[PDB]
Design a protein around this ligand. Structure first.
Ligand SMILES: O=C(c1ccco1)N1CCN(C(=O)C2CC2)CC1
Ligand SMILES: [Cl-]
Ligand SMILES: [Cl-]
Ligand SMILES: [Cl-]
Lengths: 697, 695
């Protein structure tokens, strides 16, 4: 609903934005033929958003976006992840390998051009209209001969929108010398840690600071000690006026994916297959894992990251299923398609109804296969660690069956075994997880649909899953270090070909690939029918109140700074304060430890000009803007386009917002810029960063 | 902020009127006439109730009438799960061992008691707080045969303000109190233990009884000839509901408070009582929950034991949160420093000397009190085999006449009650191993119960081996082991039994500690009499309420929510929509009654829904309540019944020491929801018809 709009759509939305509180001129925010605020927004490291906040190329993004760079520069002597990092001079800023920042220099509507090129149809069922390779050939044809060589730093890209009904060409300027400037300690940058992931109220100071470097003329250049900070076209002014309830707020960023045009049958499938299987399987896996971590402190160390990684999409699936159950997502998709079908019946065009029918029939036909795919992927591929145990390659098997190439094959198999059975791997914990996961899997998937090796549970082990799992480890070459070393001393192809763990791993990966290959053909009829479906929706209600699905391209969203009621008699306001950080402090819980410098700032009330009118220190706020994954680090703007915060998360109640925006529950979780400036100032002491920013009263 | 004596209504009336009270002072409480006070009862010795009709109908909580509902429940008529609704007066069920107490008269007898006390002689005498001594004074004042001349009536004198004020109560007790109605446990106990001490709350915590009496309305024990009581006063039911900031008041019987604790007593309560209970119960509950989650049969056997341990565990967590965040220690220190400065100015050092006596007594008993709480939480309540059978002196002087079979039958009966259908020796061994490991780390060898010295002396510090040996060799370790003993019993076998020796040794230490600690109570009590006398002489009795002591009190405040933490607000009222949001059919605690779910779907709310069409369930207020206030009537500015108190939020449990204006709330079931359940769930129209319902 309240969407993720193309920059092209700013003109037709401007009057509504102005009535909602926007004060800046249209072309100061986005001008297709000149400098605008859009020029200060970047795609940070391929998956996050960032923003230029100074005339010397300073960039703000999330702490979780700059996390890998902070970690790569951290050592036992200088742990920047734990204590933070504050370069006191430009020369002290740390270079980063494999980093990039992408500016969206120009955006052009190329729909007529692409649709004319597509008319050279050899097959009406061709998927070239969505092919990155085909669209790149069209982009290169339009840009010119050797565009990259004639315009160093620039690149051209064409993307499909609205299921293939609109095409845009993007001219991108990429910088790869992006240096680490500053970061708060992890105690501030990831205060809630995994406990507060997807949670509002939130008290996390999720920010990090970088700087774009370039050659003498401000042109992209790879890392060089001769590189100078970039003087940009445009940068954000920082506001210290703060936020109040109902204030207009807007974001620009790169939301990755949405499913706003799902049919009601696709919502049912997402719930009953994707989400229910992920929920059921991850709850079993996490339950066994948590019992083991709580019983042994060494298991807690080894499995904490694996447990946290499994919980993230588990919580998302719980939040999404809550929306399907309580917010009528299925019903609203059904009403959307019924309205198009009725309109098509009056227009004399049955193609829209035929398109929705094709989608329903394809969804109904692939149900059993998709259920088997999610069951094996969640239950075994992700669920059981020994599923990713070493499988000897065709060349490794050939090598072991007269040359020194045998010792090469054994060293390659050993390297993979050592990575599988690493310092974090527990065979005992894995056997307990596998016994619970396989018991559920064997209950859901019938004998004739099982991966060949799992048929042994009934055929050889009399249905005893524990005995089958015990036998895999007792007899396998990868069951223990001593078992691998005995194999490595006297290796034979015959031993590997009959190895119970190799056979299990090969069997489950064979079934996983067979299911993927059987399911792949069903994607194309749905994609082709969605092109007709979305064309009808656009022709009927206009490209005015229905936004194109997110596809990792630059979008804007607007709303207001506003809290919400999660449940009966409970209200979550629009703003958190430093008090909330102090209430959550737990020194014996690594997630909720409070930085001593920050604790003293709170006690002394050394808030300077960053505190609100009442003298309280703001930390974070939430807004009715429509965001998703990819929007992490996005600039949050005032009615005047000044920076008031950075988006860093969204509440679990609004995760169903990827299918249907939830006005009364969905919120973007934003770190207040006043808190960002307080941490740089009072925790980092990095005055030079404050001085180079343009701070407005 | 307080729990005021009825005598203090005159002094508080002007403030109550400015806060919204509309009723006349003597219509609420009249010392020599009929008033609203005459419709409040002490229900079954520990709860509050209220008369709501001219035929003696009484409302109280579902958890207050729980034992009576359970005693009348069978597999054929399970009233606990299905509810109970007597469709005629003759169908109302009698209850053995039940009582309702009316407070007929209250008199200040301070001068009388203090004059009688002047003839003591021993200055340290504790007769000024003795129930026996005060009863002798009560009998002397009322008359020799008072209860014979005034049937159903009895007198009682209680001390207040640490012995600085005395009141005589004339009580009328009725023991024929019949069960009339109750919602199913799914409504009466909706949150079950998960929502205990929790606001927002969606529990319809109510049950209905009726007072029966003889032909003249006089108390009489159960008789089929008994007729319903026509009371002199009953509450009118209001259907006008509540709004945020509305004046609310309660009358009831709060049991205990510690409003005059010194700062050293707050430190002791935190560092000994609460920290030990928290640490020990967390270990016990952790092992118990692991076992209940791994075996569904263990979950059935240990659910009630787990829930019983959690209740005071949660209270202790809430109390320690207040000590840590609300400055309870600091405010007590400021209170005593202000009295000490005032005493220094007046030239009276007795108040400073009294605070010093309390501090020195608290400091002197620290190690003993730590050892007491450690054994009580760690072993007496922590380990089930601590309450295993200990052969009596009569039983040992019988095994070594042929009444050896009678001794074995008595020991067998006790063994069968210890190792019952809910007892798991394996679960108990795991709990004991974790509890004793912590206990042995905290209590040094020279302070251990004699049998626990064997962990170091005989078992090389292996707690698991010591516990395994107790069960392997004990006659109470298994059924087969008991039966082998019962066939060939000898006193020598019992005298050397590892479980008997453990149980005897831990109970000996527990009693020795209790006996060593008991003498420290008296100097503190005597010093508190002087301390509270000074506080009252300095600042007066009109802000400083007397500690709760299971006597009738009133409290007033407003219907108001609160902010539990940064950016979170809990409103003043919950709705039926909140019950539906919490529904979980595969969680026995959050199952929703089908008749109630249907009422919500069809919106069959009648005259009970609010102005917006939403059905209220519960509300909260800034009244000051504690244990004993369960079932208390909640009144309007006009004295009409708007709800029943049934709980208080965990954030306000520190309110027994210091009232917490911004956090402490009484959790009340809305009377509109009570009527909705009687009407649409129970179908008991006759109960609605006999109540006086005001528009
Ligand atoms: O360090 C290793 C290891 C294995 C292979 C290379 O390093 N491990 C894994 C297994 N571990 C355990 O299971 C701990 C007893 C709990 C922790 C030690
Ligand atoms: Cl058509
Ligand atoms: Cl909504
Ligand atoms: Cl009466």
């Amino acid at each position: 609903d309240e969407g993720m709009w193309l920059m092209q759509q700013l003109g037709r939305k401007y009057a509504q934005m102005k009535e909602r509180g926007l004060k800046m001129k249209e072309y100061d925010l986005y001008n297709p033929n000149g400098t605008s605020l859009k020029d200060a927004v970047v795609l940070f490291d391929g998956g996050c958003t960032g923003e230029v906040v100074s005339d010397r190329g300073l960039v703000l993004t999330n702490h979780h976006c700059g996390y890998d760079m902070i970690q790569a520069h951290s050592t036992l002597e200088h742990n920047y992840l734990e204590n933070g990092f504050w370069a006191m001079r430009e020369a002290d800023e740390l270079p980063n390998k494999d980093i990039s920042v992408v500016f969206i220099d120009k955006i052009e509507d190329v729909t007529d051009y692409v649709k004319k090129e597509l008319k050279a149809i050899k097959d009406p069922n061709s998927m070239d209209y969505l092919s990155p390779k085909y669209l790149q050939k069209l982009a290169d044809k339009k840009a010119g001969k050797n565009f990259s060589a004639k315009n160093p730093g620039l690149s051209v890209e064409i993307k499909a929108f609205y299921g293939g009904n609109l095409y845009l060409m993007f001219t991108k300027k990429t910088y790869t010398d992006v240096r680490l400037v500053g970061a708060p300690p992890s105690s501030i940058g990831k205060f809630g840690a995994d406990t507060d992931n997807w949670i509002w109220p939130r008290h996390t100071g999720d920010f990090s600071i970088f700087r774009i470097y370039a050659d003498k003329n401000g042109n992209p250049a790879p890392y060089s000690e001769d590189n100078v900070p970039l003087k940009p076209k445009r940068f954000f002014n920082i506001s210290l006026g703060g936020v109040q309830e109902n204030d207009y707020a807007m974001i620009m960023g790169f939301p990755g994916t949405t499913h706003r045009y799902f049919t009601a049958s696709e919502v049912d499938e997402w719930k009953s297959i994707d989400n229910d299987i992920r929920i059921r399987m991850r709850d079993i896996r996490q339950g066994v894992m948590l019992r083991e971590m709580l019983a042994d402190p060494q298991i807690k160390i080894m499995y904490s990251a694996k447990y946290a990684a499994s919980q993230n999409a588990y919580k998302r699936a719980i939040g999404a299923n809550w929306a399907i159950k309580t917010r009528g997502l299925r019903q609203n998709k059904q009403a959307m398609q019924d309205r198009l079908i009725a309109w098509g019946a009056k227009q004399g065009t049955p193609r829209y109804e035929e398109a929705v029918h094709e989608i329903d029939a394809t969804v109904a036909k692939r149900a059993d296969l998709r259920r088997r795919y999610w069951m094996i992927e969640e239950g075994i591929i992700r669920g059981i660690e020994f599923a990713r145990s070493p499988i000897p390659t065709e060349d490794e098997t050939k090598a072991l069956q007269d040359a020194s190439a045998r010792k090469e094959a054994i060293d390659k198999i050993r390297t993979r075994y050592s990575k599988f059975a690493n310092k974090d791997y527990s065979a005992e914990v894995d056997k307990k997880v596998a016994v619970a996961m396989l018991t559920e899997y064997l209950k859901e998937i019938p004998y004739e649909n099982l991966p060949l090796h799992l048929r042994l549970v009934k055929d050889r082990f009399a249905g005893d899953v524990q005995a089958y799992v015990d036998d895999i480890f007792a007899r396998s070459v990868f069951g223990s270090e001593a078992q691998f070393d005995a194999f490595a001393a006297v290796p034979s192809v015959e031993k590997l070909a009959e190895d119970p763990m190799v056979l299990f791993a090969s069997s489950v990966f064979d079934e996983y690939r067979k299911l993927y290959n059987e399911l792949r053909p069903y994607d194309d009829p749905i994609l082709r029918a969605q092109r007709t479906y979305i064309a009808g929706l656009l022709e009927m209600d206009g490209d005015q109140d229905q936004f194109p699905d997110a596809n990792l391209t630059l979008r804007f969203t607007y709303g207001q700074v506003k809290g919400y009621s999660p449940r009966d008699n409970v209200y979550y306001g629009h703003q958190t304060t430093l008090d909330g950080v102090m209430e959550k402090e737990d020194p014996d819980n690594w997630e909720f430890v409070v930085d001593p410098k920050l604790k003293a700032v709170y006690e002394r009330k050394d808030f300077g000009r960053y505190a609100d009118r009442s003298g309280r220190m703001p930390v974070a706020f939430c807004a009715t803007t429509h965001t998703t994954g990819g929007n992490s680090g996005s600039p949050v703007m005032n009615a005047n386009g000044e920076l008031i915060g950075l988006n860093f998360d969204r509440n679990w109640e609004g995760v169903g917002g990827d299918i249907q925006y939830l006005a009364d529950y969905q919120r973007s979780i934003i770190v207040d810029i006043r808190y960002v400036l307080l941490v740089i100032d009072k925790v980092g002491g990095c005055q030079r960063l404050l001085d180079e920013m343009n701070i407005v009263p």
